[model samples]
Target: SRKTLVVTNDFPPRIGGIQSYLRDFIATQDPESIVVFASTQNAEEAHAYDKTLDYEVIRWPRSVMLPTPTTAHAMAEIIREREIDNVWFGAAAPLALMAGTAKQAGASKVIASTHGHEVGWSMLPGSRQSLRKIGTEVDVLTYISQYTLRRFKSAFGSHPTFEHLPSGVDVKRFTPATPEDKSATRKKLGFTDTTPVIACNSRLVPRKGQDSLIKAMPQVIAARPDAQLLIVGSGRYESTLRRLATDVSQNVKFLGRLEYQDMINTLAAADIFAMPARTRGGGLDVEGLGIVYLEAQACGVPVIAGTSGGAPETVTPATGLVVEGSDVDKLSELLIELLDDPIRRAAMGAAGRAHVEAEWSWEIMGERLTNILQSEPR
Candidate 1:
C-alpha cells in the first residue's frame, strides 16, 4: 500500500487547535508512513518548520488571505511526485479544492475534514457554490463532530461516506499534577494555592466567550470571594476581555499566549476549566469541538463548556458540565458547586482523566486515520 498525504490550510507553528492536532497525529504515526503537509502561508515567517520530522511540509503562497491557483499547482505536483495513495484535507479551504484537483490528477482517494464553522459558512449564497464543488469532488467527508456532519449533510445532501472523528489529546504529557506540584506551579504563576482557579485555555476571540466568561466572573466571585479566573491565549479580542475584567475585581488574570508545555501545566493547576463559547455578532466565528476540554480532562481537570456547537459531544457527566448557552447563572452555579466541595471536584477530575485515557488519546486517532488511508482504493 502507498502512504498517505495530508493537506491542511492550518498547520504549526500556527498556534490553533487544529495545528496541535495535526502535529501530534504526525508525531505518533510510523516513520515509514509517508505523510506530506501542504499549509498556506500569509507571511514569509510561516515557512519555518521542523524539517527533521518524519513528514514533508509545503507552504503554498496566498494573496489577500485567500486560496490561489498556486495551491492547486503545488497539490498536483506533490501527488505526482510522491505517488500519494491517499489524501486528506485537514480543513475545508483551498486545501479541499487542491485535494480534489489531486484526485482528478490520479490520486486514489481524497477526503475532507469539516471543522464546524466551514459547514455553516458553506450555507451562505456566495460560499455555497465553492462548497458544493468541493463536496462533489471529494471521495470521503469526515467531520470533527456530529454537529458539523449534520450541517454539511443538510447543505450538500448525504454523501457516500461520512465519518465523525474527534480530535485527540496528549494524555501522557497532560496527566494530573500532584497537590504539592500544583501548589508550586500556581505559586510560580503568582496565584495562591488557596484561591479557586477557573482556567480557560482558548484564544482570546469573541466567539470563544472570553467576554462572557469575564462577565460571569462577578457572579463567580460573589459566590466565592477567593475565586480567580485565568484566561490563556492571545487574539484580537484581548483588549475587550481586558476591559471587561477591569470593571470587576482584580481576580481575573490574563496569561497571554502560553507555549504547549505551559498550557498543559496551566490545565493541570486549574481547579475548574471553563470556556463559554457562543456565536458572536458577525456570525463569522464558531466553536469546533473545544479540543481544550480534552486537554483539561487529560490533566484531570473538570470543565464547564458552552453547549453550543460541538462542545456537547466532548463533555459528558464523567468529564464535565456542558451549559446550554452562555447562561451566567448556570455557569456560576457549576463553578460554585465544584469550588465549594473539594471531594466532589476531585472525583470529577479522576473521572475526567479516566475517560480521556480510555477513549481520547492520539494513538487511537492515529490508528483510525491510518485505517481510513489503507481502506482507500489503490
Candidate 2:
C-alpha cells in the first residue's frame, strides 16, 4: 500500500460538511500511511484535535491555503519529505492547481474532489478558466453528485477523468431509535408521545427553504391537529422563518442548533423529516447532496426533499418524496398523507434505513475513496 497525503482547508474544529468529510475519510485509512495537511482554523482546538488522532496532522500557519506558489511549495516539500505516493485534494478548486506541483515532488497519483461550491466556480468567468486548469493538472476530478457533474460538464465540457464520490452518512451514529426510546426522547424534548413530529434540521437559510416549511405548517396542523414542526439549526433566515410562523407559532418549534448527540436524538424522535430546499441565486445556491436527508433516513424517518440541487439524488421512492419548495399545497398535502398513514411512514422509514445501510454508509464511502486513491486514473 502507498502512503497518501490529504491536502485540504476543511478539517475538524472548523465544523461543516467538508470538514466532517475530510475527517471521516482519513479514519478509514491506515493511520500510519495517511497524513493530513490542513489550514489552521483555531490553533488550540486543532492542536488538541490532532493529538487525539493516530496519524500526523500538520496545520499550515494560514487560515486558508490558496493556489499560490508559496502554498504549492510548502505542500510539495511535505510530499518530498514524507515520501507521499498519492495526494488527494479535498474540495479541489484552488488547491488542485497544486496537483502538477505534487507530481513533480514524486506523487505518482493525484485526485481532486469537488463539492457543491465548485458548480458556482464553473459558472463564473474568472473561476471557470481556473477550474479547467485545475482539471488538467489532476489525474482525476471526482464529483460528489450528478448535479455537480452535470453543471461542470455544461460549463467546460467533459473532464478528462471523473468519479462518483458523494459524501456518506454515519449509519452507525445517525441510527433509528426504538419505538419506546423514541417516545422517551420526545418526552425529554418536551413533546408528547402522540405528537407527529415533522423535523427539519438544516442551516436556516433561504436556499434551505425553512420559510416554505413554516408556511405549510398551518395546513399541516389543520389536517393533523397535534402535528408539530421541529426546526433545528440557526442562520440569518431564522427571524424571517419565525416571523412567518407567528400566526401558527404554537404548532412550530424552533429548537435552534443542537449539539450532535442532541440533534441525532431529536431526529430519531421525528416521525417525518422535511427540508424543502429550493434553488436561489438563479441556480447558484443549491444543496450539494443534503447529507441530513440521508441522516434522517438513517434514523428511520421518511424524508421529503425539494426539487433543487442534488437533494433529489439522496431520495428514493422507497425512502421519501420530492416536490417544489414554493408549492405549499403540495408540501402540506404530502406532509398530511405521511403523518396520517403510520403504516406507509413505517414502511418508508424501514426502506430508507436499509437503503442507507447498503449504499450511503461511511464504510461504503470510505471504500470508494480508498479505491479512487489506490487505482490508476481513467
Candidate 3:
C-alpha cells in the first residue's frame, strides 16, 4: 500500500497530449494512493477536475519564467507528512529540480518522465544540465516513446535506467461501433451519413499540422467532392488553420472542443483519422506516441500522421499511413486513395482495432507501470 506523488506542471485544463495521458492514467489508478502537486493557474478548473476523482491534488501558484522557489522544501514536507516514498514527475526538466530536492531529503525514489516537448517547448531553464545531473540520481527516467528516448540520447547520451513506454488506450471505451451504432452516430454528429469524413483531433498547433491538412483539403475535395474534415480541439493556431480552410470553407468544420466521449464518438464516425504533425523547435518538439491515432484506430478508423517524432511509431503499414510532414500534395494523394477504397479502410480499421487489443490497451500499460514502480532494487 505504498503511495507516490506525481509532481507536474502539466495536467487536465493544460490542453496537451501528455496532460491527457496523465489524466487517463491517474483515473485507472486508485485515487487514494496517488497524490498530485500541480499548477494553480486556472485553480477553479483544477478543483472541479479533482472533485470527481478520489486522488488528492495540491495546487500552488507558479510561473515558468520564474523558477519555483523552495519547492524542494515543500515537496519534502509532503513526502514526510504523508510518508510518501515514491515521487513521479510528469516532465523531466520542469519538476526535476524539485523532485531532486525531495530525493536529497530522502524521498527514496524519483521518476522523471520525458515527453516530446520537454527539450523544446516546455523545458524549464537549466533543465538540460539538471536532467543530466538527475540521470542516475533518480530511481528511473521514463520516456513516453522511443522518439523521446532518442531525443534524450541525442541531447545527453546513454543512461542505464532509462525506459521507453507509451501510454495505453482504453479498449473497452474505444471499440468500433456496430453498423446501427455507426448510423446513429452519423445522425447524432450531423454529418451526411455517407460522406467520406477525414477526422483530425489534435490541439491546434503548428507541430500538430492541422493547417497542412487543411491545405491538402482542397486537393482531396477536388478529387472526391464528398470528402469532409472534422477538426476537434482548440489552440492559438486555430486562426491560421481557419485561414487555410477558407478556400474550401464549405467542406471543413471546426468542432473547437468536445467532451472526452463525444470526441471518441466523432472519431468513430470518421472514415480516416489524420494529423500531419511535424517536429519544429529543431527536432526537439515532436509527437510523443500519438494516443489519438491509436484511439481512432481502436474505434475502427484508420489514421495518418506526419513522419515526425513518435507518430510513425504509433502507425503500422497495415493500419495507417505516414506521410511527409507538411507535404500538401502528398497528403492530398493519400486521402484520395484511401477515400476511394472503402474496402482498404475497413480492413485497416479492423487491423488497427486488433493491434490495440493485442498491445496498447490501458490495462496492459497500467500493469507495466505498476510493475516498474513496485520492483525492488538490488
Candidate 4:
C-alpha cells in the first residue's frame, strides 16, 4: 500500500540530472516503503547500485525511445506484482504514457515530471498533438522549474493540478573541503599548486554550451596564462568538443566521465565552475536548471552559467556570474575576476554552500515530495 515505482531513461553508469535526483530521493526515503526504480540501460550494472540501496531496480535490456509498448506492459506488470500505490514518471512524454497505462491498470495515482527540453519540444507545431495526448492522461503533472510549468500551460492549456518542484541535491556530500584539503586534491589529481583551474562538469552535449565554453578559452588564456580548463562527462558531442579543444589551447583537458566522489573532488579543487549552457537549435534543446552548477556551488566553488533556461535560478550574484549565451568576452572577464580575487571567491563560495544547505538538500525535497504524494487528489 505504501509503495511507489519510479521510471526514467537515465540512471547510473549513464549519469544525468534526473538520475542523480531519483537516486538521492530513494536514498533518503523510508526503506519500509517498497520503492522500485525502472530504467533503460545495462540491467546488471543498474542492479549493482540498487542492491546496495535495498531497492528493486528494473532495467530494460535496450535503450529505446520512450512510449514504447514494451515499457507500458512492463509498468503494468510491475504495478500488479508490487501493488504499487503510485507511479512517478521521470520524463514527460512516453514515460507519462506508460505511467498512465499503469494507472489505468489499477495503480491509484500517476505523476509525470516535465523537464525543460521535453516541454519545449512537445510544444512545437508538429509535436503538440502527441504531447497533448500525453499531458491529459496523468493525475498530477510536475515541473522542474516555473519556466517549464509556464511553457507546458502555454502549450497544452493550464492544468489545475500541475506542480513545480525541482530536483534535490545531496548537500552533505558536496560540502566544501578546507583550502588545504582542496589543494591536496588538486595535487593528487596532478595539477600544479599555482595553476588556476576552471571546471565544466556536464554531459558533453551541444545544448550544454560545451562549444561556447571552448570558444571562450582563448580569451581566458590571454588574461591568465596559468589558467587551465577541465571538461568532464561524455556524450554524443564528445568527439566534436575534443576537436574544438585541440584547436584552441592545450591547457584544456578532457577528463571524460568520473564517479560521483571523483566529480565532487574535482569540483572542490576548481577555482571556478563554468557552464555556459544555451538553448541549442533555436530552443530545440535547452538546459534544465543546470544542477551541476548547484553541486559545484554546494562545494564552495563559484559558478559561471549562461543566462538561459533554469540556470539563472541556480547562480545568484553572490555565488557566481550568469552571462549571456556564447559571450566569450563576458565569460573571460568573470574567469579573470574569480581567479584574481581569492577573498571574494571564498565569500561567494560561502554564500553558495549556505544557500544549498538551507534550501537544496534531498531531505527537504523528500519531505515536500512525500507531502504532495499523500495529499488528496486535486
User: Which number leads on TM-score?
Assistant: 2
The predicted structure with the larger lDDT, 2 or 4, is: 2
TM-score of 2: 0.96
Task: Give per-residue CA lDDT, model 2, range 274-325, as digits (tens).
Answer: 9998998867888886898999989999999999989999989999999899
Clashes of each: 0, 0, 0, 0
User: Counting only residues 3 or more apart in sequence or on different chains, how many pairs clash (N, Cα, C under 3 Å) in candidate 1?
Assistant: 0
Task: Compute the lDDT for candidate 1.
Answer: 0.76
Candidate 2 clashes between residue pairs 3 or more apart in a chain or in different chains: none
Q: What TM-score quantifies how close candidate 1 is to the native fold?
A: 0.87
Residue pairs that clash (backbone atoms under 3 angstroms), model 3: none
RMSD of 4: 3.4
In candidate 1, which residue ranges exceed 4 Å CA deviation?
A: 37-50, 58-74, 98-101, 121-126, 190-192, 282-284, 376-378
Between candidates 1 and 4, the one scoring higher on TM-score is 1
lDDT of 1 by residue, 236-344 (tens): 9898888888867488888888887888788899999988778665554667767888888899998888866788777789778887446777777778888998888
* Deviation (Å) of 378 in candidate 1: 10
Give lDDT tens digits, candidate 4, residues 186-268: 88777876888999998888878778778878887888877888999889999998899886657888888998888888888
TM-score of every model versus the real structure: 0.87, 0.96, 0.87, 0.84
Give residue 223's error in model 1 in angstroms: 3.2
lDDT (10s digit) by residue, model 3, range 1-378: 557788887877776677887887777666777898877668677678778777788876673312266766777788888778678887776567575677666667777787666565466777677666666566678787777766665454355377666889989999887777777777876766788898999889889988888888888988888788889998998998888888888899899889988888888888999998887877666777788888988898988878887888887998999998778899899999999899999999999999888888988788777765666631
